[PDB]
């Protein structure tokens, strides 16, 4: 609920019901850090950079993880991002995920 939680990126605490829990890891991220990280990754990096800013997970080298990860991240990004950035997410996702190793 309203108990405070430290942002894993910037180190500042907010009520937990304002924070963004990344479904794939246990990091809690504040809304501003969340929006900035994923917006910059979309506009300036690759869709493989769409991972946690504090721990770098998940490992997007496992193709069996991609649908679960990106479909859950989708819902968080729709509420967080500006409409143009959310549309860019879908464009990049439609273009595919480069599989590193």
């Amino acid at each position: 609920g309203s108990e405070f939680q430290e942002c894993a990126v910037c180190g500042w605490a907010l009520p937990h019901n304002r924070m963004q829990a990344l479904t794939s890891c246990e990091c809690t991220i504040c809304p501003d850090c969340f929006r900035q990280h994923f917006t910059i990754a979309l506009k300036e990096k690759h869709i493989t950079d769409m991972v946690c800013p504090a721990c770098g997970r998940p490992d997007l080298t496992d193709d069996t993880q991609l649908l679960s990860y990106f479909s859950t991240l989708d819902i968080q990004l729709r509420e967080s991002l500006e409409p143009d950035a959310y549309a860019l997410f879908h464009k990049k996702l439609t273009e595919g995920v480069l599989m590193r190793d």
Binding site: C7, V9, C10, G11, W12, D32, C33, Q36, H37, I40, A41, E44, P53, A54, C55, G56
Partner: protein, 154 residues
């Protein structure tokens, strides 16, 4: 306000309690947290008779984009050019991780000062000299430190 301001205030509060050993005299205007000045004070020959002023320039998008380091003091080193640009892999755009904090960046910088990386140099002449005959390199670097370096603090 911005992620950069929150994050850099966090980093500064952690440095101000645990001062860094080889990075001293850290100066940051609380009105502009995106530029830090400080003094690099190396521990080993050939650089341990001088100190080196540096500036850390953080982008407005920090910590989601890396800082840049510029030496203001001249230094004789294969990985630092004559304009003070430093090739430091941990803060390259291709390597940058937003979780990296400035204390780790400085530790990485000091490790580079201690152990040049002549395989990827900004001054190929000095990289050759460091690889073929370090004793000669070390004498040249000591003299350059004496001639153009800054005075060390106590």
């Amino acid at each position: 306000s911005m992620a950069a301001s929150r994050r850099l205030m966090k980093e500064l509060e952690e440095i101000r309690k645990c001062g860094m050993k080889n990075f001293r005299n850290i100066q940051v205007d609380e009105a502009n947290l995106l530029t830090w000045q400080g003094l690099i004070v190396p521990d080993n020959p050939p650089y341990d008779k001088g100190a080196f002023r540096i500036e850390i320039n953080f982008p407005a998008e920090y910590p989601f984009k890396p800082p840049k380091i510029t030496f203001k003091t001249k230094i004789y080193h294969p990985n630092i050019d004559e304009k003070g640009q430093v090739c430091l892999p941990v803060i390259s755009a291709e390597n940058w991780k937003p979780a990296t904090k400035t204390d780790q960046v400085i530790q990485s910088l000091i490790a580079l000062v201690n152990d040049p990386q002549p395989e990827h140099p900004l001054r190929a002449d000095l990289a050759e000299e460091y690889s073929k005959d370090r004793k000669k390199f070390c004498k040249n670097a000591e003299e350059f430190t004496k001639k153009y370096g800054e005075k060390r603090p106590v």
